[PDB]
mmCIF file of C-alpha atoms in Angstrom:
data_model
loop_
_atom_site.group_PDB
_atom_site.id
_atom_site.type_symbol
_atom_site.label_atom_id
_atom_site.label_comp_id
_atom_site.label_asym_id
_atom_site.label_seq_id
_atom_site.Cartn_x
_atom_site.Cartn_y
_atom_site.Cartn_z
ATOM 1 C CA UNK A 2 129.061 40.497 160.675
ATOM 2 C CA UNK A 3 128.538 37.319 162.293
ATOM 3 C CA UNK A 4 132.310 36.973 165.537
ATOM 4 C CA UNK A 5 130.314 34.764 167.589
ATOM 5 C CA UNK A 6 133.590 32.070 167.144
ATOM 6 C CA UNK A 7 135.861 34.651 167.561
ATOM 7 C CA UNK A 8 134.291 35.465 170.787
ATOM 8 C CA UNK A 9 134.279 32.151 171.759
ATOM 9 C CA UNK A 10 138.095 31.662 170.990
ATOM 10 C CA UNK A 11 139.105 34.526 172.794
ATOM 11 C CA UNK A 12 137.065 34.123 176.454
ATOM 12 C CA UNK A 13 138.666 31.291 176.354
ATOM 13 C CA UNK A 14 142.065 33.215 176.187
ATOM 14 C CA UNK A 15 140.252 34.715 179.002
ATOM 15 C CA UNK A 16 140.717 32.284 181.366
ATOM 16 C CA UNK A 17 143.749 31.588 180.825
ATOM 17 C CA UNK A 18 145.133 36.084 180.347
ATOM 18 C CA UNK A 19 146.512 38.417 182.844
ATOM 19 C CA UNK A 20 143.210 40.510 184.520
ATOM 20 C CA UNK A 21 145.030 43.354 182.021
ATOM 21 C CA UNK A 22 145.384 41.089 179.496
ATOM 22 C CA UNK A 23 140.941 40.632 180.410
ATOM 23 C CA UNK A 24 140.766 43.613 180.349
ATOM 24 C CA UNK A 25 141.815 44.207 176.902
ATOM 25 C CA UNK A 26 139.722 41.297 175.581
ATOM 26 C CA UNK A 27 136.740 43.601 177.330
ATOM 27 C CA UNK A 28 137.227 46.789 175.243
ATOM 28 C CA UNK A 29 138.078 44.436 172.021
ATOM 29 C CA UNK A 30 134.625 43.196 172.526
ATOM 30 C CA UNK A 31 132.250 46.050 174.099
ATOM 31 C CA UNK A 32 134.158 49.177 172.306
ATOM 32 C CA UNK A 33 135.363 47.395 169.162
ATOM 33 C CA UNK A 34 132.741 44.998 167.901
ATOM 34 C CA UNK A 35 129.321 45.884 169.409
ATOM 35 C CA UNK A 36 130.183 49.580 168.204
ATOM 36 C CA UNK A 37 131.313 48.291 164.703
ATOM 37 C CA UNK A 38 128.442 46.315 164.430
ATOM 38 C CA UNK A 39 125.632 48.378 166.299
ATOM 39 C CA UNK A 40 126.489 52.033 165.362
ATOM 40 C CA UNK A 41 129.140 52.272 162.316
ATOM 41 C CA UNK A 42 128.242 49.696 160.380
ATOM 42 C CA UNK A 43 125.378 51.544 160.283
ATOM 43 C CA UNK A 44 127.069 55.002 159.888
ATOM 44 C CA UNK A 45 128.572 53.823 156.494
ATOM 45 C CA UNK A 46 125.608 51.641 154.880
ATOM 46 C CA UNK A 47 124.846 54.197 151.878
ATOM 47 C CA UNK A 48 129.008 55.129 151.733
ATOM 48 C CA UNK A 49 128.622 54.530 147.429
ATOM 49 C CA UNK A 50 124.827 55.392 147.072
ATOM 50 C CA UNK A 51 124.492 58.921 148.784
ATOM 51 C CA UNK A 52 128.090 60.278 147.556
ATOM 52 C CA UNK A 53 127.508 62.667 144.777
ATOM 53 C CA UNK A 54 129.215 64.234 142.077
ATOM 54 C CA UNK A 55 128.659 67.427 139.820
ATOM 55 C CA UNK A 56 129.191 65.907 136.335
ATOM 56 C CA UNK A 57 126.676 63.954 133.928
ATOM 57 C CA UNK A 58 129.248 61.518 132.909
ATOM 58 C CA UNK A 59 128.669 58.231 133.371
ATOM 59 C CA UNK A 60 131.605 56.356 135.507
ATOM 60 C CA UNK A 61 133.073 59.496 137.306
ATOM 61 C CA UNK A 62 131.277 58.648 140.614
ATOM 62 C CA UNK A 63 132.381 55.013 140.546
ATOM 63 C CA UNK A 64 136.073 56.198 139.659
ATOM 64 C CA UNK A 65 135.378 59.254 142.324
ATOM 65 C CA UNK A 66 134.152 57.482 145.246
ATOM 66 C CA UNK A 67 137.278 54.415 144.460
ATOM 67 C CA UNK A 68 140.749 57.026 144.470
ATOM 68 C CA UNK A 69 138.551 58.729 147.620
ATOM 69 C CA UNK A 70 138.133 55.252 149.403
ATOM 70 C CA UNK A 71 140.233 52.653 148.198
ATOM 71 C CA UNK A 72 138.927 50.679 151.461
ATOM 72 C CA UNK A 73 136.094 51.611 153.890
ATOM 73 C CA UNK A 74 136.812 52.560 157.160
ATOM 74 C CA UNK A 75 134.974 49.806 158.937
ATOM 75 C CA UNK A 76 136.781 46.723 155.999
ATOM 76 C CA UNK A 77 140.208 48.221 157.886
ATOM 77 C CA UNK A 78 138.460 48.250 161.312
ATOM 78 C CA UNK A 79 137.186 44.116 160.856
ATOM 79 C CA UNK A 80 140.956 43.838 160.151
ATOM 80 C CA UNK A 81 142.724 45.378 162.916
ATOM 81 C CA UNK A 82 139.868 43.259 164.982
ATOM 82 C CA UNK A 83 140.948 39.994 163.006
ATOM 83 C CA UNK A 84 145.049 40.416 163.264
ATOM 84 C CA UNK A 85 144.671 42.378 166.446
ATOM 85 C CA UNK A 86 142.948 39.212 168.637
ATOM 86 C CA UNK A 87 145.644 36.631 165.873
ATOM 87 C CA UNK A 88 148.044 36.527 168.498
ATOM 88 C CA UNK A 89 146.131 35.625 171.584
ATOM 89 C CA UNK A 90 144.059 32.242 169.616
ATOM 90 C CA UNK A 91 148.486 31.579 169.055
ATOM 91 C CA UNK A 92 148.567 32.210 173.086
ATOM 92 C CA UNK A 93 145.485 30.496 173.130
ATOM 93 C CA UNK A 94 147.222 27.410 170.922
ATOM 94 C CA UNK A 95 150.526 27.057 172.893
ATOM 95 C CA UNK A 96 148.523 26.350 176.067
ATOM 96 C CA UNK A 97 145.823 23.861 174.756
ATOM 97 C CA UNK A 98 148.707 22.393 173.674
ATOM 98 C CA UNK A 99 150.408 21.872 176.366
ATOM 99 C CA UNK A 100 147.845 21.082 178.718
ATOM 100 C CA UNK A 101 146.652 18.086 175.725
ATOM 101 C CA UNK A 102 150.937 17.040 176.692
ATOM 102 C CA UNK A 103 149.988 17.410 180.159
ATOM 103 C CA UNK A 104 147.334 15.245 179.663
ATOM 104 C CA UNK A 105 149.006 12.810 177.977
ATOM 105 C CA UNK A 106 151.779 12.170 180.201
ATOM 106 C CA UNK A 107 149.353 11.585 183.152
ATOM 107 C CA UNK A 108 147.873 9.268 180.631
ATOM 108 C CA UNK A 109 151.406 6.782 180.263
ATOM 109 C CA UNK A 137 150.328 29.143 184.685
ATOM 110 C CA UNK A 138 152.382 31.931 183.268
ATOM 111 C CA UNK A 139 156.588 30.778 183.513
ATOM 112 C CA UNK A 140 158.701 28.558 180.517
ATOM 113 C CA UNK A 141 157.773 28.518 177.360
ATOM 114 C CA UNK A 142 154.826 29.206 178.258
ATOM 115 C CA UNK A 143 155.920 33.405 179.271
ATOM 116 C CA UNK A 144 158.283 33.682 176.316
ATOM 117 C CA UNK A 145 154.729 33.148 174.051
ATOM 118 C CA UNK A 146 152.822 35.461 176.054
ATOM 119 C CA UNK A 147 154.898 38.071 175.776
ATOM 120 C CA UNK A 148 155.104 37.338 172.071
ATOM 121 C CA UNK A 149 151.532 37.940 172.090
ATOM 122 C CA UNK A 150 151.962 41.573 173.695
ATOM 123 C CA UNK A 151 154.682 42.475 170.838
ATOM 124 C CA UNK A 152 153.395 41.609 167.998
ATOM 125 C CA UNK A 153 149.663 43.074 169.435
ATOM 126 C CA UNK A 154 151.208 46.390 169.644
ATOM 127 C CA UNK A 155 152.792 45.766 167.129
ATOM 128 C CA UNK A 156 149.407 45.285 164.584
ATOM 129 C CA UNK A 157 147.836 48.246 166.818
ATOM 130 C CA UNK A 158 150.498 50.922 165.438
ATOM 131 C CA UNK A 159 151.225 49.885 162.118
ATOM 132 C CA UNK A 160 146.982 49.560 161.471
ATOM 133 C CA UNK A 161 146.769 53.328 163.289
ATOM 134 C CA UNK A 162 149.293 54.737 161.194
ATOM 135 C CA UNK A 163 148.239 53.404 157.917
ATOM 136 C CA UNK A 164 144.732 54.913 159.181
ATOM 137 C CA UNK A 165 146.507 58.183 159.407
ATOM 138 C CA UNK A 166 149.146 58.124 155.825
ATOM 139 C CA UNK A 167 145.532 56.649 154.144
ATOM 140 C CA UNK A 168 142.946 58.991 154.990
ATOM 141 C CA UNK A 169 144.019 60.884 157.999
ATOM 142 C CA UNK A 170 141.539 61.347 160.938
ATOM 143 C CA UNK A 171 139.128 63.746 159.527
ATOM 144 C CA UNK A 172 136.796 63.509 156.600
ATOM 145 C CA UNK A 173 136.201 66.427 154.503
ATOM 146 C CA UNK A 174 132.585 67.029 152.920
ATOM 147 C CA UNK A 175 134.408 67.951 149.545
ATOM 148 C CA UNK A 176 135.828 65.842 147.075
ATOM 149 C CA UNK A 177 137.682 66.842 144.312
ATOM 150 C CA UNK A 178 138.478 64.083 141.670
ATOM 151 C CA UNK A 179 140.195 64.300 138.449
ATOM 152 C CA UNK A 180 140.273 60.612 137.283
ATOM 153 C CA UNK A 181 139.396 59.820 134.319
ATOM 154 C CA UNK A 182 136.750 59.482 132.476
ATOM 155 C CA UNK A 183 136.105 61.860 134.781
ATOM 156 C CA UNK A 184 136.854 65.766 132.933
ATOM 157 C CA UNK A 185 138.935 68.092 133.846
ATOM 158 C CA UNK A 186 138.620 68.186 138.254
ATOM 159 C CA UNK A 187 135.482 67.418 139.435
ATOM 160 C CA UNK A 188 133.986 68.338 143.067
ATOM 161 C CA UNK A 189 132.567 65.713 144.729
ATOM 162 C CA UNK A 190 130.532 64.901 148.479
ATOM 163 C CA UNK A 191 130.732 62.228 151.372
ATOM 164 C CA UNK A 192 128.068 61.056 153.203
ATOM 165 C CA UNK A 193 127.633 62.116 156.067
ATOM 166 C CA UNK A 194 131.357 63.440 156.676
ATOM 167 C CA UNK A 195 131.601 64.243 160.497
ATOM 168 C CA UNK A 196 129.632 61.561 162.033
ATOM 169 C CA UNK A 197 132.140 59.393 159.817
ATOM 170 C CA UNK A 198 135.021 61.807 161.891
ATOM 171 C CA UNK A 199 133.046 61.326 165.090
ATOM 172 C CA UNK A 200 134.211 57.629 164.905
ATOM 173 C CA UNK A 201 137.381 57.925 163.141
ATOM 174 C CA UNK A 202 138.479 59.267 165.894
ATOM 175 C CA UNK A 203 136.499 57.418 168.656
ATOM 176 C CA UNK A 204 137.866 54.126 166.710
ATOM 177 C CA UNK A 205 141.139 56.213 167.659
ATOM 178 C CA UNK A 206 141.138 56.968 171.135
ATOM 179 C CA UNK A 207 139.530 52.953 171.467
ATOM 180 C CA UNK A 208 142.905 51.570 169.995
ATOM 181 C CA UNK A 209 145.120 54.245 171.978
ATOM 182 C CA UNK A 210 143.847 52.460 175.504
ATOM 183 C CA UNK A 211 144.184 48.987 173.357
ATOM 184 C CA UNK A 212 147.927 50.214 173.601
ATOM 185 C CA UNK A 213 148.195 51.465 176.805
ATOM 186 C CA UNK A 214 146.911 48.082 178.319
ATOM 187 C CA UNK A 215 149.462 47.054 176.234
ATOM 188 C CA UNK A 216 152.229 48.367 177.576
ATOM 189 C CA UNK A 217 150.747 48.080 181.175
ATOM 190 C CA UNK A 218 150.650 43.876 180.561
ATOM 191 C CA UNK A 219 154.125 43.841 179.316
ATOM 192 C CA UNK A 220 155.507 46.509 182.883
ATOM 193 C CA UNK A 221 152.894 44.478 184.732
ATOM 194 C CA UNK A 222 155.159 41.606 184.016
ATOM 195 C CA UNK A 223 157.758 43.161 183.440
ATOM 196 C CA UNK A 224 157.362 44.002 187.542
ATOM 197 C CA UNK B 2 114.793 90.754 109.366
ATOM 198 C CA UNK B 3 113.776 92.971 106.773
ATOM 199 C CA UNK B 4 115.899 95.295 104.580
ATOM 200 C CA UNK B 5 113.917 96.762 101.810
ATOM 201 C CA UNK B 6 114.385 100.594 103.623
ATOM 202 C CA UNK B 7 118.185 99.917 102.802
ATOM 203 C CA UNK B 8 118.058 98.383 99.993
ATOM 204 C CA UNK B 9 115.277 101.235 98.640
ATOM 205 C CA UNK B 10 118.259 103.578 99.574
ATOM 206 C CA UNK B 11 121.405 101.993 98.313
ATOM 207 C CA UNK B 12 119.616 101.591 94.879
ATOM 208 C CA UNK B 13 119.202 105.593 95.044
ATOM 209 C CA UNK B 14 123.053 105.220 95.495
ATOM 210 C CA UNK B 15 123.474 103.012 92.862
ATOM 211 C CA UNK B 16 121.938 105.196 90.226
ATOM 212 C CA UNK B 17 125.048 108.088 91.927
ATOM 213 C CA UNK B 18 127.719 105.750 91.810
ATOM 214 C CA UNK B 19 130.601 104.619 90.268
ATOM 215 C CA UNK B 20 130.721 101.698 88.480
ATOM 216 C CA UNK B 21 133.318 99.364 90.747
ATOM 217 C CA UNK B 22 130.742 100.990 93.513
ATOM 218 C CA UNK B 23 127.804 99.450 91.471
ATOM 219 C CA UNK B 24 129.630 96.363 92.052
ATOM 220 C CA UNK B 25 130.433 96.924 95.679
ATOM 221 C CA UNK B 26 126.479 97.869 96.484
ATOM 222 C CA UNK B 27 125.619 94.677 94.348
ATOM 223 C CA UNK B 28 127.744 92.579 96.929
ATOM 224 C CA UNK B 29 126.955 93.568 99.724
ATOM 225 C CA UNK B 30 123.346 92.669 98.896
ATOM 226 C CA UNK B 31 124.124 89.401 97.258
ATOM 227 C CA UNK B 32 126.806 87.868 99.220
ATOM 228 C CA UNK B 33 126.199 89.413 102.270
ATOM 229 C CA UNK B 34 122.654 90.398 103.108
ATOM 230 C CA UNK B 35 121.478 87.599 101.354
ATOM 231 C CA UNK B 36 123.226 85.175 102.824
ATOM 232 C CA UNK B 37 122.820 86.303 105.868
ATOM 233 C CA UNK B 38 119.731 85.511 105.296
ATOM 234 C CA UNK B 39 119.123 82.423 103.439
ATOM 235 C CA UNK B 40 122.211 80.902 105.209
ATOM 236 C CA UNK B 41 123.952 82.021 108.087
ATOM 237 C CA UNK B 42 121.139 83.215 110.381
ATOM 238 C CA UNK B 43 119.645 79.738 110.390
ATOM 239 C CA UNK B 44 123.920 77.410 111.148
ATOM 240 C CA UNK B 45 123.212 80.269 113.939
ATOM 241 C CA UNK B 46 119.619 79.647 114.837
ATOM 242 C CA UNK B 47 120.652 77.467 117.531
ATOM 243 C CA UNK B 48 123.685 78.420 118.645
ATOM 244 C CA UNK B 49 121.702 78.431 123.234
ATOM 245 C CA UNK B 50 119.583 75.388 122.315
ATOM 246 C CA UNK B 51 122.315 73.035 121.007
ATOM 247 C CA UNK B 52 125.169 74.316 123.274
ATOM 248 C CA UNK B 53 125.809 71.760 125.858
ATOM 249 C CA UNK B 54 128.104 71.353 129.288
ATOM 250 C CA UNK B 55 129.429 68.661 130.858
ATOM 251 C CA UNK B 56 127.580 69.594 134.182
ATOM 252 C CA UNK B 57 124.723 69.415 136.632
ATOM 253 C CA UNK B 58 124.898 72.915 138.105
ATOM 254 C CA UNK B 59 122.106 75.008 136.965
ATOM 255 C CA UNK B 60 123.316 78.391 135.408
ATOM 256 C CA UNK B 61 126.786 77.234 134.196
ATOM 257 C CA UNK B 62 125.401 76.865 130.669
ATOM 258 C CA UNK B 63 124.049 79.774 130.855
ATOM 259 C CA UNK B 64 126.860 82.611 131.401
ATOM 260 C CA UNK B 65 129.491 79.477 129.728
ATOM 261 C CA UNK B 66 127.659 80.477 126.195
ATOM 262 C CA UNK B 67 127.621 84.578 127.150
ATOM 263 C CA UNK B 68 131.967 83.821 127.658
ATOM 264 C CA UNK B 69 131.832 81.771 124.601
ATOM 265 C CA UNK B 70 129.390 83.960 122.920
ATOM 266 C CA UNK B 71 129.469 87.796 124.301
ATOM 267 C CA UNK B 72 127.901 88.513 121.023
ATOM 268 C CA UNK B 73 126.979 86.221 117.788
ATOM 269 C CA UNK B 74 128.777 86.539 114.486
ATOM 270 C CA UNK B 75 125.352 87.485 112.822
ATOM 271 C CA UNK B 76 124.434 90.205 114.828
ATOM 272 C CA UNK B 77 128.058 90.633 114.689
ATOM 273 C CA UNK B 78 127.798 90.604 110.542
ATOM 274 C CA UNK B 79 124.143 93.225 111.268
ATOM 275 C CA UNK B 80 126.161 95.759 112.916
ATOM 276 C CA UNK B 81 129.025 95.353 110.249
ATOM 277 C CA UNK B 82 126.471 96.328 107.375
ATOM 278 C CA UNK B 83 125.127 99.300 109.022
ATOM 279 C CA UNK B 84 127.870 100.400 109.024
ATOM 280 C CA UNK B 85 129.570 100.142 106.252
ATOM 281 C CA UNK B 86 125.889 101.434 104.069
ATOM 282 C CA UNK B 87 126.264 104.338 106.974
ATOM 283 C CA UNK B 88 128.515 107.329 104.480
ATOM 284 C CA UNK B 89 126.838 105.155 101.557
ATOM 285 C CA UNK B 90 123.912 107.214 103.107
ATOM 286 C CA UNK B 91 125.675 109.971 103.872
ATOM 287 C CA UNK B 92 126.880 110.858 100.445
ATOM 288 C CA UNK B 93 123.279 110.333 98.393
ATOM 289 C CA UNK B 94 122.094 112.771 100.979
ATOM 290 C CA UNK B 95 124.918 115.589 100.031
ATOM 291 C CA UNK B 96 123.574 114.332 96.673
ATOM 292 C CA UNK B 97 119.800 114.775 96.992
ATOM 293 C CA UNK B 98 120.354 118.568 99.264
ATOM 294 C CA UNK B 99 122.322 119.568 96.156
ATOM 295 C CA UNK B 100 119.484 118.538 93.148
ATOM 296 C CA UNK B 101 116.910 120.293 95.962
ATOM 297 C CA UNK B 102 119.001 123.282 96.386
ATOM 298 C CA UNK B 103 120.217 123.208 92.264
ATOM 299 C CA UNK B 104 116.344 122.928 92.294
ATOM 300 C CA UNK B 105 115.117 125.795 94.342
ATOM 301 C CA UNK B 106 117.562 127.864 92.926
ATOM 302 C CA UNK B 107 116.390 127.277 89.130
ATOM 303 C CA UNK B 108 112.705 128.073 90.359
ATOM 304 C CA UNK B 109 113.877 131.338 92.512
ATOM 305 C CA UNK B 137 128.249 114.271 88.696
ATOM 306 C CA UNK B 138 130.775 113.628 90.835
ATOM 307 C CA UNK B 139 133.419 116.782 91.175
ATOM 308 C CA UNK B 140 133.709 120.469 93.299
ATOM 309 C CA UNK B 141 132.172 119.570 97.288
ATOM 310 C CA UNK B 142 130.138 116.301 95.780
ATOM 311 C CA UNK B 143 133.618 114.527 94.747
ATOM 312 C CA UNK B 144 135.206 115.253 98.033
ATOM 313 C CA UNK B 145 132.292 114.100 100.535
ATOM 314 C CA UNK B 146 132.140 110.580 97.790
ATOM 315 C CA UNK B 147 136.238 109.696 98.092
ATOM 316 C CA UNK B 148 135.206 110.727 102.087
ATOM 317 C CA UNK B 149 132.490 107.727 102.351
ATOM 318 C CA UNK B 150 135.135 105.763 100.294
ATOM 319 C CA UNK B 151 137.352 106.347 102.582
ATOM 320 C CA UNK B 152 134.814 105.626 105.954
ATOM 321 C CA UNK B 153 133.956 102.585 105.038
ATOM 322 C CA UNK B 154 137.059 101.220 104.061
ATOM 323 C CA UNK B 155 138.570 102.399 107.719
ATOM 324 C CA UNK B 156 134.974 100.454 108.996
ATOM 325 C CA UNK B 157 135.631 97.222 107.594
ATOM 326 C CA UNK B 158 138.809 96.908 108.516
ATOM 327 C CA UNK B 159 138.069 98.064 112.260
ATOM 328 C CA UNK B 160 134.855 95.635 112.208
ATOM 329 C CA UNK B 161 137.856 92.480 110.379
ATOM 330 C CA UNK B 162 139.841 93.636 113.268
ATOM 331 C CA UNK B 163 137.313 93.354 116.075
ATOM 332 C CA UNK B 164 136.011 90.020 114.705
ATOM 333 C CA UNK B 165 139.524 88.662 114.964
ATOM 334 C CA UNK B 166 140.692 89.437 118.591
ATOM 335 C CA UNK B 167 137.464 88.370 119.720
ATOM 336 C CA UNK B 168 137.035 84.842 118.081
ATOM 337 C CA UNK B 169 139.792 84.450 115.710
ATOM 338 C CA UNK B 170 138.401 82.715 112.345
ATOM 339 C CA UNK B 171 137.867 79.481 113.827
ATOM 340 C CA UNK B 172 135.899 78.166 116.012
ATOM 341 C CA UNK B 173 136.793 74.966 117.607
ATOM 342 C CA UNK B 174 134.084 72.507 119.307
ATOM 343 C CA UNK B 175 134.948 72.734 123.029
ATOM 344 C CA UNK B 176 134.639 75.742 125.031
ATOM 345 C CA UNK B 177 136.798 74.963 128.549
ATOM 346 C CA UNK B 178 134.444 77.239 131.040
ATOM 347 C CA UNK B 179 135.598 78.190 134.996
ATOM 348 C CA UNK B 180 133.174 81.205 135.614
ATOM 349 C CA UNK B 181 130.496 80.963 138.328
ATOM 350 C CA UNK B 182 128.561 78.943 139.299
ATOM 351 C CA UNK B 183 130.508 76.493 137.453
ATOM 352 C CA UNK B 184 132.565 74.245 139.108
ATOM 353 C CA UNK B 185 135.967 74.698 139.232
ATOM 354 C CA UNK B 186 136.549 74.355 134.916
ATOM 355 C CA UNK B 187 133.714 72.912 132.879
ATOM 356 C CA UNK B 188 133.704 71.068 128.924
ATOM 357 C CA UNK B 189 131.349 72.230 127.186
ATOM 358 C CA UNK B 190 130.078 72.083 123.071
ATOM 359 C CA UNK B 191 129.348 73.956 120.640
ATOM 360 C CA UNK B 192 126.602 74.075 118.108
ATOM 361 C CA UNK B 193 128.134 73.174 113.948
ATOM 362 C CA UNK B 194 131.312 74.425 114.905
ATOM 363 C CA UNK B 195 132.895 73.481 111.125
ATOM 364 C CA UNK B 196 129.502 75.011 108.922
ATOM 365 C CA UNK B 197 130.179 78.102 111.432
ATOM 366 C CA UNK B 198 133.964 78.252 110.472
ATOM 367 C CA UNK B 199 132.587 77.872 107.262
ATOM 368 C CA UNK B 200 130.376 80.557 107.041
ATOM 369 C CA UNK B 201 133.122 83.028 109.443
ATOM 370 C CA UNK B 202 135.632 82.523 106.048
ATOM 371 C CA UNK B 203 133.002 83.621 103.535
ATOM 372 C CA UNK B 204 132.131 86.290 105.466
ATOM 373 C CA UNK B 205 136.068 87.299 106.057
ATOM 374 C CA UNK B 206 136.718 87.237 101.987
ATOM 375 C CA UNK B 207 133.652 88.977 101.155
ATOM 376 C CA UNK B 208 134.435 91.610 103.455
ATOM 377 C CA UNK B 209 138.210 92.299 101.794
ATOM 378 C CA UNK B 210 136.318 91.462 98.350
ATOM 379 C CA UNK B 211 134.573 95.139 98.979
ATOM 380 C CA UNK B 212 138.470 96.380 100.349
ATOM 381 C CA UNK B 213 139.971 95.649 97.477
ATOM 382 C CA UNK B 214 137.123 97.421 95.506
ATOM 383 C CA UNK B 215 136.809 100.111 97.519
ATOM 384 C CA UNK B 216 141.201 100.414 96.876
ATOM 385 C CA UNK B 217 140.360 100.021 93.402
ATOM 386 C CA UNK B 218 137.803 103.104 94.205
ATOM 387 C CA UNK B 219 139.922 105.398 94.671
ATOM 388 C CA UNK B 220 142.472 104.443 91.986
ATOM 389 C CA UNK B 221 140.287 104.817 89.339
ATOM 390 C CA UNK B 222 139.335 108.734 90.863
ATOM 391 C CA UNK B 223 143.306 109.035 91.634
ATOM 392 C CA UNK B 224 143.512 108.326 87.413
#
């Protein structure tokens, strides 16, 4: 995963952002992207190769892994990172557009319409963070148990399947939840600093 | 299985038995002992070696075979043959005892006490045949289905196990049932010929 281009754009957003916004971006880079690439990806590397079911039925392990893990937590976190970054890019684009328009007018910061877009950016960021949190909760909860009981065809009756690294995965699930909640708190602080 | 000694004693009983009794003994020799040794034993030879369960659990196939087949049909039929033969041996022993006593008295057939023992022999034969029939019914029924579902520990949850030769085994189950019922009819005819 090469996050270079998103990083380069979000550092530009850092130049035009509030101090709390700069903190939020630093959290995104260090506590989400960096952890994901240095720690979590490895943890989940053997998610299917080390997933085992007590059965001689061909195809059962495939369908049972798929049912247990419709989307890997790491993929979900990648999507979450991209969506919570997107409004920042929208605001930065409006910034660059107004700067280029100003340069043109000359040939021939946060107030006004730019402040309205900034605050909308903070709102959409908040809603997307909340949505991904709640989706993670309703899909997986905040804990991975070692045992998964599977009755999906072709599996005969109910089969016992065993997860790879349930405890380490639970640790990182809770870590990423905490980081997301810190991000929400930062957004709320941005909207209370702007309000005040 | 060497039935030589039982055969030699039951042929003696044939010498002292009624014509219907001789038919009964012939049925025992030809349609039970001979079939058991020439056909059924082979059918059941691979009862456990060819019994298969869809599982990776060590020990599950053992416990599941044991639960499905607490006693093999062939062992049950051996026991049945021996018990339905036993009263015949009792009657023959009473016969030989009275003959030896007569020889002694000389030194120094079916009436009297010998007829009472004969009729008791026919009664116990009938009750034992009925008992083994009903036991077979309550234990296995009169049909072996290919699939046996097993939840006995250590088997995880419910496991699918497959029987060896279910249809051939069902054929021989029904054959042996029919032979037993013919034997019962013969006993009833003995008691109606004696009554008349």
